[PDB]
């Protein structure tokens, strides 16, 4: 209710971009009858597209889950959750779409899945594109590219073309007033764990549980998944398969998760860390080779077993 008034950009097939601001309660048919005299097209000709769906002429502008300085497109023919880099706290996200071939928007989607659906895979849906005079073809390629989705932070002003955020698919609004396991305290916003029992935790506990299993390098290792966490109850095969959820914790709390994961990867894969102070660079030396150098670094030479200066004789102590 701060302003109420919304400002939106319009990018059609032709290179021109139109800046028009409207009140959230105008009919799309009315919007169609506003865009048409704007470029000189007939009101009957214009089809509007937004996030994939052919916009209903009657639906309210506010209904479209639309933020500020967003983009809609026209042509003559006839409850999410994401983490933002700018906004540390997770925010309600919006879902938009881009073409695979031309890396542009404004295209129709065949499926239009509501929620709790098969998604986040490179190959899923093909759609017609408006840019480049409908020249997005896969017929020639053979190898199939598809319409891929992306998310934007809906709590602030956005840069329509390339702005994105990390989707946290394990965070849901507590629709059935389910209590958090850790505190038995029903939180409006909670996280759902991947196990069969569908164990759930709130944000405070997600943070305390994380920052407690962090200082001692206790993150469980799965090669494909990455250094993630098991279920609080320790249920089998319940590893958080998308790591970005850890970003609920701030810089220091999260950035160190990256460092430790790297160090432990080097260690287990056979690598050795640089023992010169303040280096710690992990160098994956070929298993048989026993001469430790420091590639693009302090060049101190070591023995794999002794952690000391390069000695010719075997290190007994």
């Amino acid at each position: 209710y701060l302003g109420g008034s919304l400002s939106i950009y319009i990018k059609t097939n032709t290179g021109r971009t139109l800046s028009v601001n409207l009140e959230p309660q105008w009919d799309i048919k009315n919007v169609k009858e506003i865009v048409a005299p704007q470029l000189g097209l007939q009101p009957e000709e214009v089809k509007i597209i937004f996030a994939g769906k052919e916009l209903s002429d009657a639906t309210t502008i506010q209904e479209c889950d639309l933020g500020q300085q967003s983009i809609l497109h026209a042509i003559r023919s006839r409850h999410f959750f994401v983490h933002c880099a700018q906004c540390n706290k997770l925010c309600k996200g919006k879902l938009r779409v881009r073409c695979s071939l031309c890396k542009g928007g404004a295209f129709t989607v065949h499926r239009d899945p509501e929620c709790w659906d098969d998604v986040l895979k490179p190959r899923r849906i093909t759609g017609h594109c408006e840019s480049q005079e409908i020249a997005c073809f896969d017929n020639e390629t053979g190898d199939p590219p598809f319409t891929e989705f992306y998310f934007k932070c809906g709590e602030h002003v956005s840069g329509g073309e390339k702005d994105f955020a990390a989707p946290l698919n394990l965070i849901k609004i507590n629709i059935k007033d389910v209590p958090c396991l850790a505190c038995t305290e029903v939180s409006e916003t909670v996280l759902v764990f991947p196990c069969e029992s569908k164990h759930v935790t709130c944000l405070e506990c997600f943070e305390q549980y994380c920052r407690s299993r962090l200082s001692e390098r206790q993150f469980m290792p799965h090669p494909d998944i990455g250094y993630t966490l098991p279920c609080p109850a320790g249920c089998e095969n319940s590893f958080i398969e998308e790591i970005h959820h850890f970003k609920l914790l701030s810089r220091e709390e999260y950035a160190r998760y990256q460092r430790f994961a790297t160090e432990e990867y080097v260690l287990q894969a056979g690598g050795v860390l640089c023992p010169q102070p303040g280096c710690g660079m992990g160098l994956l030396v070929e298993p048989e080779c026993k001469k430790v150098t420091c590639q693009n670094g302090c060049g101190y030479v070591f023995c794999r077993n002794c952690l000391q200066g390069y000695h010719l004789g075997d290190c007994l102590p």
Binding site: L181, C183, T184, E185
Partner: protein
Amino acid sequence: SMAASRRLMKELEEIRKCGMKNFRNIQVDEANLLTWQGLIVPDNPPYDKGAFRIEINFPAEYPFKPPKITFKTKIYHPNIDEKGQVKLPVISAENWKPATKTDQVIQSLIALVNDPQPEHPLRADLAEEYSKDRKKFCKNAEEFTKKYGEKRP
């Protein structure tokens, strides 16, 4: 330290109203919420009606890390250390669910006291004794537990 200390406090509150006969005299030092003092009266003869004073200190990560328990009153028991430390399977970090309530752990400790387990001893000498010879064990047990521990009506 928020959903942690408050849950701990809530558990404490429920434990207080649940004045179960076995665990009495709850003493929570108002300074530190993370440490508790208690007094336990076993129903069984080896530790017959003799109250043993224990201390429970909870980690700063209480909901996701098992609490440790010490015995301030010396006790002749195989699964109980000389220092007073205790090996309770429900506690041990290898198999501890966060949902496990404090009273359920305390009840598990009581059951451990009444019927000792020589399968995993912290004090080997006492374990071999009880497994092989019970009557002489019970004599040493009752003798020591009347020698240490304050009786309560």
